[PDB]
Amino acid sequence: GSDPAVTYYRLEEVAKRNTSEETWMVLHGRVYDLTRFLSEHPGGEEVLREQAGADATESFEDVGHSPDAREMSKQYYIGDVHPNDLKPK
Amino acid sequence: GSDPAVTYYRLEEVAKRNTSEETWMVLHGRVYDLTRFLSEHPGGEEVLREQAGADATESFEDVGHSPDAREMSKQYYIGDVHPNDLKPK
Ligand code: HEM
Ligand code: HEM
Ligand SMILES: [Mg+2]
Ligand SMILES: [Mg+2]
């Protein structure tokens, strides 16, 4: 069941956005446009460039971001990963 | 100049890695060294051999790879396609 209020992106569409002109990334089943965040990230640009257009959930959690960082991610949230591209829990 | 965190490859060079000794492939503007991946590819070696050395984004996405297949590709990423060789738009 897709949610009328949410815009969904297939991982194929996220994979296209892997350039400095447009960088998207998936974190926990949600899509973030970090294009403008790249030069402001306190963890630097490179870690984000390397996984541009991809699901970087594991790296994000391995680093262990703070509640403050998670709060900050909300400003870049743009949609949910299409139901079909979500993995079983 | 470009981005020093990125090694760039011209499609002319990528095209030469089309045998089992060294097979590279392009997916969404990035180069992947699949030489060790061939044996382990669930869809078999032949489908990779067929587009070895070329951009196989279309066939990759048309097949419908899973989130796990995408995660798996990351370890083979060696660099980006030279900007001159990408689509103009
Ligand atoms: C919109 C998503 C993201 C936001 C808002 C964000 C935000 C931040 C912030 C605020 C910090 C400072 C320390 C703290 O608050 O925990 C930080 C550090 C860091 N971030 Fe992120 N980050 C994001 C995504 C990522 C991703 C996807 C990666 C990995 C590919 C990453 C890798 C790092 C690293 C390596 C550090 C350094 C911390 C350490 O020394 O271990 N971040 N990030
Ligand atoms: C780094 C590049 C690639 C990786 C890591 C990869 C990985 C995988 C994995 C893990 C599967 C199992 C099903 C799934 O998880 O989706 C799979 C299946 C398959 N792959 Fe690939 N693949 C790659 C490139 C390609 C390319 C370029 C082609 C086409 C020329 C291809 C054709 C197939 C086919 C036909 C299947 C079977 C589909 C099924 O019924 O699930 N793959 N691949
Ligand atoms: Mg060499
Ligand atoms: Mg994953």
Side-chain angles (χ1 to χ4, degrees), chain A residues 6 11 19 21-22 34-35 41-42 45 47 70 72 79:
Chain A
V6 178
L11 288 177
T19 69
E21 281 79 55
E22 200 178 15
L34 305 176
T35 312
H41 181 221
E45 177 169 21
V47 289
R70 299 179 190 271
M72 188 178 314

Side-chain angles (χ1 to χ4, degrees), chain A residues 29-56:
Chain A
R30 291 192 156 194
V31 183
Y32 298 76
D33 165 12
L34 305 176
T35 312
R36 256 58 110 279
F37 184 60
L38 295 177
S39 52
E40 286 171 49
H41 181 221
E45 177 169 21
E46 173 65 11
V47 289
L48 300 188
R49 184 209 60 76
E50 188 196 311
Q51 284 189 73
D55 183 331

Side-chain angles (χ1 to χ4, degrees), chain B residues 1-68:
Chain B
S2 50
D3 193 321
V6 189
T7 284
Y8 289 87
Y9 297 99
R10 290 183 160 279
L11 291 175
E12 177 179 1
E13 277 309 304
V14 178
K16 290 164 188 178
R17 279 67 183 192
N18 69 337
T19 73
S20 52
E21 287 300 285
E22 184 173 33
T23 293
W24 289 1
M25 178 172 296
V26 160
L27 299 171
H28 300 288
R30 293 181 166 196
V31 179
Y32 294 82
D33 179 349
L34 304 179
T35 308
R36 296 173 187 280
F37 180 62
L38 292 193
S39 312
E40 304 314 313
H41 179 233
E45 304 202 17
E46 193 50 53
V47 298
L48 299 183
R49 278 180 207 136
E50 307 189 328
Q51 295 185 64
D55 180 333
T57 305
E58 208 201 349
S59 303
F60 180 82
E61 293 299 349
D62 284 333
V63 158
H65 291 77
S66 76
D68 293 307

Side-chain angles (χ1 to χ4, degrees), chain A residues 2-14:
Chain A
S2 259
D3 187 321
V6 178
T7 297
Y8 290 96
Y9 295 100
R10 288 196 102 302
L11 288 177
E12 164 174 15
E13 286 303 313
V14 174

